[PDB]
Design a protein around this ligand. Structure first.
Ligand SMILES: O=C(CO)[C@@H](O)[C@H](O)COP(=O)(O)O
Lengths: 205, 198
C-alpha cells in the first residue's frame, strides 16, 4: 500500500462523499475479503448492478441497532451459531415500488425504503432479497468486521449510519483476495482502506 | 410439446445438466443438490442473483431444525424462506462457489442433523408447499416436483438469471443462456400440465 492509515481513511471519506465507493479489506487471518460498499443514500442502480455482477450477489444493508428496532426487524437467529457472529436480521422487501425485488433497481428502492427518514416497519415486507446487518455498538473498536467498518465510515463521512456492502468475487467463483480487490478498486476508482486502518483512526481520534 | 419439454428436463437433470425454469416472469437455473458441481455453482453466482437457494421438503426442514424465517410472511409472493445456513465445517466464510456447494451437500446428506449446519449463513433454504406446483406454482415447488419426477431426493438448487446490467433476464435471454450452457428449458405451465395428465 501507500501512505498512512490516516490519509487512507480520509480518502475513504472523500470517495464516499464523492459518490465513489470503497473497498474495505480486512484481516488476512480473518475473512480475508474486501467489500464493495456505498452509502445507502447515494448508491446508484448502475452501482448495485456492478455489485450483483462482481460481488457475492448477497448484497447487505448495514444498519444501526436503533434503526433495526424502528423497522422492527428481529435478529434472524437467537442462537447465532455462525463463525463470524455476522449480524443478519430478517431479510426485507420494499413494500411497493418493486416486483420480485431481485433486480438491481428493486434492491436500491428497498434500501431507500429501509433508510428513509421516518421509515416504518410496514414499509417493508418479509422475507425479501435485501439483507440487513445489525452493526455492533462501538463499531470496529467493539467488533472488527465489514458491517461495523461500513457504519463507522458513513458516520465519519457525515451520512446516515447505513451502508450497502458485498464481497468481491473472482469469475471462477473463488473469493477475490487482496491483490484482486485492489486492482478492481483501482479500475472503479473506489478508495481502498482496511479495517486495521479504521481501528487505528478511531482510536487516534 | 409441453410434455416433451418436461421429459427432456428430467433428462437434463438426470444427466447432470441444468434446467432453465420459467413462468413472476423470471427464469431460474436449477440443478439437483445431489449432483450440482462447483463450476456449476460458480456459474450460478456469475450470472445469477447471487441469492442461491436450496429448495427442500418440510420433512427435511424439520430434520434440520430450520425455522421459517418470519412467522408473519408479508412477502409479495409468500416466499418460503427459512432461517439461512452454513456447513458447520468444510467451509470458511461460506460464500465461495465451493463453500456454498459444501453447505448444500451438508444439508441434503442422508442423516443430516441440525448441528451439521450453523446459522446464519450464505445459503438460503426454501421450503416448498406440500402438493408441489398444484398448490403453489413457484420456482420452489417446480423444482422439487422436477427433482422428484427425475428420480432425485426432493432437494434442488435454484437461482434467478440476471443480465450484467442488473435487469432480470427475460425469457428470450434465459433461452439464450440455456443455449450457451446446454440446459433444457421447461415452464411452470408445461410442468403443471404434465403432473395433471399423469
Ligand atoms: O454478510 C456478509 C456478506 O453478505 C459478510 O460475511 C461479509 O463478508 C462481511 O460481514 P462481516 O462478517 O465483516 O460483519
Amino acid at each position: 500500500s501507500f501512505g498512512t492509515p490516516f490519509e487512507r481513511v480520509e480518502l475513504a471519506l472523500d470517495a464516499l462523499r464523492e459518490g465513489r465507493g470503497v473497498m474495505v479489506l480486512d484481516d488476512e487471518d480473518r475473512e480475508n475479503e474486501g467489500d464493495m460498499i456505498f452509502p445507502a443514500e447515494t448508491m446508484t442502480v448502475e452501482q448495485m448492478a456492478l455489485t450483483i455482477r462482481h460481488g457475492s450477489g448477497i448484497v447487505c444493508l448495514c444498519i444501526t441497532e436503533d434503526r433495526r428496532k424502528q423497522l422492527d426487524l428481529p435478529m434472524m437467529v437467537e442462537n447465532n451459531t455462525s463463525a463470524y457472529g455476522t449480524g443478519f436480521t430478517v431479510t426485507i422487501e420494499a413494500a411497493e415500488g418493486v416486483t420480485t425485488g431481485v433486480s438491481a433497481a428493486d434492491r436500491v428502492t428497498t434500501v431507500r425504503a429501509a433508510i428513509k427518514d421516518g421509515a416504518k416497519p410496514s414499509d417493508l415486507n418479509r422475507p425479501g432479497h435485501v439483507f440487513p446487518l445489525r452493526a455492533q455498538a462501538g463499531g470496529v473498536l467493539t467488533r472488527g468486521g465489514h458491517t461495523e467498518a461500513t457504519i463507522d465510515l458513513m458516520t465519519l463521512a457525515g451520512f446516515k449510519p447505513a451502508g450497502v456492502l458485498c464481497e468481491l468475487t473472482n469469475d471462477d467463483g473463488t473469493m477475490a483476495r487482496a491483490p484482486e480487490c485492489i486492482a478492481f478498486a483501482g479500475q472503479h476508482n473506489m478508495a481502498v482502506v482496511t479495517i486495521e486502518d479504521l481501528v487505528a483512526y478511531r482510536q487516534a481520534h
